[PDB]
Amino acid sequence: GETTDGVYRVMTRRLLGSTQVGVGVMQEGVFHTMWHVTKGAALRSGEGRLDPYWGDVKQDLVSYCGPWKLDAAWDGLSEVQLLAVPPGERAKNIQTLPGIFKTKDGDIGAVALDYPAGTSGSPILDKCGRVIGLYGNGVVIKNGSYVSAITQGKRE
Amino acid sequence: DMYIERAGDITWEKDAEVTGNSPRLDVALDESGDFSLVE
Ligand SMILES: CC(C)NC(=O)[C@H](Nc1ccc2c(c1)CNC2)c1cc(Cl)cc2[nH]ncc12
């Protein structure tokens, strides 16, 4: 059905009324989202049907219709923008400077912004407009605030 | 059954809400894709 490039909401009807489980990015005919949002289940765009193509629980990413297409990376210096699409509220650009997640396998960017779980999958952007990752997989720190990683998949 | 609805265009908005801190957290990524703090 609809295959226009942009940001989309991921909704469900199995619960009361209509509920937003997450968000995603359509780009180059491919719908990119976080795995925990859909659990690898097939999606419906209008009357059309999107099917999973690639997925990985550890990376917490999943792509529909084709391979992962987003490949831009945070430079470690510049401020970025979270294009947050919160449940029931309009899309909103929130600019922030990312922090760091120190892992045994290397450092990853991190955005310390607080949004409901249904915002999982919102794109993180750079000054060029390129999607440098998805927001929605992270950790809760000492003061109850939420800090997400800048999750980016690998292109082919 | 899940479905998608368009929410906007992917573009940088000049002069938008500038908020949020930038912390250096020590974390661990498990096989189930879950993050956890390390101290
Ligand atoms: C558990 C929590 C600390 N982690 C999150 O990142 C939440 N989702 C989430 C992410 C990854 C996995 C799962 C769930 C399941 N297993 C893989 C999540 C997202 C957002 Cl946008 C706001 C959140 N507030 N509290 C949790 C929360």
Copy the structure tokens of residue A85: 């699409």
Report the Cα A103 to chain-centroid distance in Å.
20
A147 and chain B in contact, CB less than 8 A:
yes
Delineate the domains of chain A, giving CATH numbers in brackets.
6-64 (2.40.10.120), 80-149 (2.40.10.10)
Active site residue A36: yes
| H or E element in which residue A134 lies | strand A131-135
Residue of B nearest to A38 (CA): B2
DSSP structure string for A9-51: EEEESSSSS-EEEEEEEEETTEEEEEHHHHTT--EEETTEEE-
Resolution (A): 2.6
Helix or strand or coil: residue A118? helix
- Structure tokens that stand for A8 in this block: 């989309």
CA distance A114 to A112: 7
Q: What percentage of chain A's residues is helix, strand, coil (to nearest 5)?
A: 5, 45, 50
- DSSP state for residue A151 in the 8-state scheme: B
Nearest to A141 among B6, B30, B37 (CB): B37
Place of tokens 């289940």: A41
